[PDB]
Design a binder for this molecule. Structure first.
Ligand SMILES: N=C1c2cccnc2N(O)C(=O)C1C(=O)NCc1ccc(F)cc1F
Ligand SMILES: N=C1c2cccnc2N(O)C(=O)C1C(=O)NCc1ccc(F)cc1F
Ligand SMILES: [Mg+2]
Ligand SMILES: [Mg+2]
Ligand SMILES: [Mg+2]
Ligand SMILES: [Mg+2]
Ligand SMILES: [Zn+2]
Ligand SMILES: [Zn+2]
Lengths: 183, 367, 367, 183
DNA sequence: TGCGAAATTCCATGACA
DNA sequence: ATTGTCATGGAATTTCGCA
DNA sequence: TGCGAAATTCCATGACA
DNA sequence: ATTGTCATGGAATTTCGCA
């Protein structure tokens, strides 16, 4: 079989609803299966319309052969199926109530949830401005299995923003108190 | 009188040849030369004569001399003509140069992607969805280009667009021209926060941003073709143009900007499949080899009458937006430092230090 | 299928070389070439493939082929690519030329003064006494120039000025560009009443009025110098500039325009006195000898990739005032007649006959 | 002595007052002594101001060494003397009540008076527009003494407007009736 | 029939919206 | 049915002054 | 080891306000 | 303290297919 490559498979999913940040409530997460490279797009709803708008930005940079998702309404709609067919993108769905992707992607989606939670507390309405530095952090994170970061696997070079000081990613005991106060 | 008095009685003076007869007539010293009888004025009158002749139409060397030679003769006339040409402030700042700039430098291609971005604005364009301008960002090594529509060429719109772009990666250097959006302190503050060094072209010299300027040509050219026989609704086409140009082959390179950035085509039409059986690490090894071996042009031959700047030389900077019937050149300034054969620092007409391209300089004539 | 069916079983077809093995795989005819395994599409699919590849970014020959070659191979691919390039209307009218115009003609200097006037307007200038423009009239043989300030570049102001000028003498020909003041029927009527033939430059080509254009440079240059450090009160200076330039030597000719017109200097500074002992008839005889023996330049060498027009050739006229994101060239037209190597008549995109300079034409690419 | 040349001597004089023609009442006549070439300038008055304005036009084409005139007020003024000195022009005056110039110039000034009179009758307020064709006629008139016209002596070429049909210059008997009617 | 310096000619450069 | 031009100042070439 | 044709490389031209 | 660039299509050169 052929070796796995970037742009073979994008894994997409929505995170939210989040507290409002400059109008936006959700985050469309896109992860390249081979590299682990992550793109994050803020949206006002988990709709087909918002998915098409965000992915039109990404697919003007690079088009995947396959998009993988759960059976969410925005991804199973006939409008999104028509959008994917126009661009030659095969859609691939996991079984309902049994979401599966890959170890690398599962752990990347785990990192994204916990990194967002850790930066949400203290400033929960200001995550729109932090999405750039979140992506840079995620994409310059050292991989245990593979030798390289997602940035290195996608571009074939070292980055100008290496994150050597590895953030703990767990919440400190004081951050648990302020997180438990609101909701 | 003193010098000309000894000439009349017959003695030799240096400069005045012996074989012609010098005589007095109508109270004036004269000489019979092959052209005719010319008046020899005294030394103390010659600067005034050269000036009166020059000031008729502020003529150059030969046209000024041809006026003087109608009436007068004296030794080394053009030397006195050239002395006045180099002292006439009006001629120095109004006349054109007749020496071309030295041949252009072809600076090295940046070694890696994200080493150097070139950014610039296009516009104003016809209004499309309320948008008038396009921010164009070109990676120097790959030529990979990002397009962002804006309502003005502002610092705020530049910062919003680059915050989206820098989600992918941060560059070492951003090169731009001296437009208002890029020279403001707000933008320098934005770059220092992210460890980005801001590099600026010499003023009024878009050659220096030539990487992104040339891409602007391709962007406008494709947009023009796509909009033939249609209203100029270019806002919806920017994503299409961005993708189309990023996957267009350069015939001299044999690669697309997408291929130089990623080392593999995405799911676009006519994707190259030569590295299908290679692993990604084998693919990235071939990509490092491809990046280093790209064709790079060399400095062309100098034109037969070019000038190159020297430290201490008198040079004049071009006036930027010269008003009607006003000089095209500033007053003479001195070359402090030669940064490269095409770029210098000068001690300006105001007193400031200024870094300029020699394309916006002429060497001051007559030393 | 028919052509490719015989290829699979082993027979020879012209265009397809024998030394490579052609086979079937996934329902498609393929071939193993040194670059890799390529698909051979049937004849009936190739025009669609070339078009799909070209239309990605409307690329030229090599950049379009490099896309096709990633997947496909067939005999003489560039021939099918070039066929589509010559049929793509968007590329033909949007792309630039890469062939320079043939070398310029240096038409003969008019034999006599008043044989041909060259007229043109300068302006708008800064308001001076209510005046904004200058009518410039240059005699072709002598270079003798008349200046007239006007409030607009109008036919009425042109007629008033030339009525004053033609008090001295009537010209055979007046050459002008196609500005509104000179193309109006009122001006043609004024010229026919006086037996003056109106000659017009090809459109959008001030080279053709180069005699008066070059004089405009000298007029503005001297005015600029005289107005240094002063408000731009140029109305009172036009008589001074006219006299100064009419008595300025041309270094290559060795004569002033005044001298070529009258054969003797008037009471201006530094008047030439070489013909003082001659009679006027002897002076006018020397003037006829001087007029015929003036230096005349010759056509320069053609550039290494220039084109010259041929009858029946497809050419495209440049768009005059092209709007933003619109093509720079009109649709192809045919050369009816070749007036000279630099000037042609074409059957225009509308249907009209039109006389144009080749500087405003490109040869249509791909025949 | 040196042969006579163009621009050696301009002969100037005023003709008028004439009937009004687009504001103008007088004509400043300038005749080159050597060639007989004539310049005509319309003026509103026989003043120094009007003389300086008209001659500033002529002297932007060519400057004479000498200007000759009668002792008219406009020519004997200190302002006109200052104007001439600025341009290196020597002024030369005839004796009062004894105007003299040259045979060629006297006959040229005669031609101008009679040619103006002949075109004045019938259209006496429209002589401003006819001054161009009057000059062309005068300057392409064959000289009896010299072989050539003024145009030929000044420029050294034939003209594009030769006046072969020599006008009679005398008034017809019908033109005497309309001339004697008004004044 | 030859030298050093001055005078002349050559001509690439650039700007006429 | 129309078409480049020419002032400018360093450099290249020719002429001049003297022997 | 050499031919005719196709494929590739060369590179002057022009436009990015 | 900074620096031209490169798509384009005829032409020139090299390679290919065959012998
Ligand atoms: N004048 C400009 C400008 C002024 C202020 C700000 N931005 C500017 N930009 O971006 C430009 O591109 C300008 C321009 O003239 N471009 C044309 C052009 C000419 C020559 C060349 F080699 C390259 C090239 F792009
Ligand atoms: N565009 C012009 C124009 C348009 C309409 C009417 N009159 C015009 N005139 O008189 C011009 O001079 C115009 C012009 O561009 N001149 C600049 C110029 C460029 C190149 C060249 F070889 C000579 C040259 F003078
Ligand atoms: Mg800019
Ligand atoms: Mg630009
Ligand atoms: Mg014009
Ligand atoms: Mg013009
Ligand atoms: Zn000057
Ligand atoms: Zn096309």
């Amino acid at each position: 079989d052929r070796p796995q490559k970037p742009f073979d498979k994008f894994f997409i999913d929505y995170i939210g609803p989040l507290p409002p940040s400059q109008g936006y409530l959700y985050v469309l997460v896109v992860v390249d299966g081979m590299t682990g490279f992550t793109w994050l797009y803020p949206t006002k709803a988990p709709s087909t319309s918002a998915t098409v708008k965000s992915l039109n930005v990404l697919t003007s940079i690079a088009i995947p052969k396959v998009i993988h998702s759960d059976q969410g309404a925005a991804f199973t709609s006939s409008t999104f199926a028509e959008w994917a067919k126009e661009r030659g993108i095969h859609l691939e769905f996991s079984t309902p109530y049994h979401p599966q992707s890959s170890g690398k992607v599962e752990r990347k989606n785990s990192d994204i949830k916990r990194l967002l939670t850790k930066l949400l507390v203290g400033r929960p309405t200001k995550w729109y401005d932090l999405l750039p530095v979140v992506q840079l952090a995620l994409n310059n994170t050292y991989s245990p299995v593979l030798k390289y970061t997602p940035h290195q696997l996608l571009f074939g070079i070292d980055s100008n923003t290496p994150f050597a000081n590895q953030d703990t990613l767990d919440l400190t005991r004081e951050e648990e108190l302020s997180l438990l106060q609101e909701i | 009188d003193a010098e000309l008095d000894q000439l009349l009685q017959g003695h030799y003076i240096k400069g005045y040849p012996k074989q012609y007869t010098y005589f007095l007539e109508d109270g004036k010293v004269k000489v019979s030369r092959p052209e005719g009888v010319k008046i020899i004025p005294p030394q103390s009158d010659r600067q005034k004569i050269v000036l009166q002749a020059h000031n008729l139409a502020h003529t150059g060397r030969e046209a000024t001399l041809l006026k003087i030679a109608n009436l007068y003769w004296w030794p080394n006339m053009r030397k006195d003509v050239v002395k006045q040409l180099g002292r006439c402030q009006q001629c120095l700042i109004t006349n054109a140069s007749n020496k071309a700039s030295g041949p252009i430098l072809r600076p090295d291609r940046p070694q890696k992607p994200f080493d150097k971005f070139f950014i610039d604005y296009i516009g104003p364009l016809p209004p499309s969805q309320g948008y008038l301008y396009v921010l164009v960002v070109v990676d120097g090594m790959t030529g990979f280009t990002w397009l962002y529509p804006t309502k003005a060429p502002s610092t705020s719109a530049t910062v919003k667009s680059l915050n989206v772009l820098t989600s992918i990666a941060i560059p070492k250097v951003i090169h731009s021209d001296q437009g208002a959006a890029f020279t403001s302190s707000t933008f320098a503050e934005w770059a220092k926060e992210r460890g980005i060094h801001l590099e600026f072209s010499t003023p009024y010299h878009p050659q220096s941003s030539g990487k992104v300027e040339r891409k602007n040509s391709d962007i406008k050219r494709l947009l023009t073709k796509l909009l033939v026989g249609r209203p100029t609704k270019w806002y919806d086409l920017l994503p299409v143009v961005q993708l189309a140009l990023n996957n267009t082959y350069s015939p001299v390179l044999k690669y697309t900007p997408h291929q130089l950035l990623f080392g593999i085509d995405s799911n676009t039409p006519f994707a190259n499949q030569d590295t299908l059986d290679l692993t990604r690490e084998e693919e990235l090894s071939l990509l490092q080899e491809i990046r280093t071996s790209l064709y790079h042009p060399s400095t062309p031959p100098a034109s037969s009458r070019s000038w190159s700047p020297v430290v201490g030389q008198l040079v004049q900077e071009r006036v930027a937006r010269p008003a009607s019937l006003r000089p095209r050149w500033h007053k003479p300034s001195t070359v402090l430092k030669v940064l490269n054969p095409r770029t210098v620092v000068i001690l300006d007409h105001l007193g400031n230090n200024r870094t300029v391209s020699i394309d916006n300089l002429k060497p001051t004539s007559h030393q």
